[PDB]
Amino acid sequence: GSEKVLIAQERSAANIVQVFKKAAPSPISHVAEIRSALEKGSRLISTMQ
């Protein structure tokens, strides 16, 4: 008997390469991360850096 509304959740897109700069107190200087999702069902599977 209570009216409930679903709020849209904002997420980052999958299957795109994103390159970022790690900060100074770290041996890593740059990282290239991609998150992979199958087209059928649109569900996250694995992350590779």
Binding site: E3, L6, A8
Partner: protein, 49 residues
């Protein structure tokens, strides 16, 4: 059938978007009570992210 029925009902009623026993460390506020103070507020709540 009580598994799917109770899971969907719990998640929509409480807003915790996961299993009931997994409520800790789970996304909350995905579902909210619809605002009905005025018509414009209902429209705004239905178009929120």
């Amino acid at each position: 059938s009580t598994t799917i029925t109770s899971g969907l009902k719990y998640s929509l009623a409480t807003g915790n978007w996961g299993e009931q026993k997994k409520a800790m460390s789970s996304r909350a506020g995905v579902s909210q009570v619809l605002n009905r103070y005025t018509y414009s507020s209902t429209l705004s709540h239905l178009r929120r992210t």
